Amino acid sequence: MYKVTLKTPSGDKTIECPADTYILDAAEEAGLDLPYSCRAGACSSCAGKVAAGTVDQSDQSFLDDAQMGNGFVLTCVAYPTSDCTIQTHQEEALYENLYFQ
Numbered sequence: 001m002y003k004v005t006l007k008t009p010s011g012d013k014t015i016e017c018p019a020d021t022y023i024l025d026a027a028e029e030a031g032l033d034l035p036y037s038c039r040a041g042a043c044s045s046c047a048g049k050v051a052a053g054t055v056d057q058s059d060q061s062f063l064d065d066a067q068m069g070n071g072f073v074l075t076c077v078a079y080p081t082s083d084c085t086i087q088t089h090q091e092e093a094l095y096e097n098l099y100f101q
């Protein structure tokens, strides 16, 4: 898998997310304070933030490719296309920016 360090409001943890399996599976495995939702992309409140590396969230709701470069991504239907660091609870970041990055 790819090693993605999820940045949670409680800290950070490196998970192993397969190139076929969405981050949240490995994310919850790692022990994050990450909720569980649809895994189908019915919303974007559970939108992770690509702090580092990259992931596959092309079919994200109202998030665009540029947002991924900005470091804004989806946790439900996305997984690392490389080893990365992914912020969790920063859903707003796609909506505005959250001023994190």
Ligand code: FES
Pocket: 036, 037, 038, 039, 040, 041, 042, 043, 044, 045, 046, 076
């Ligand atoms: S629950 Fe609908 S996208 Fe996470």
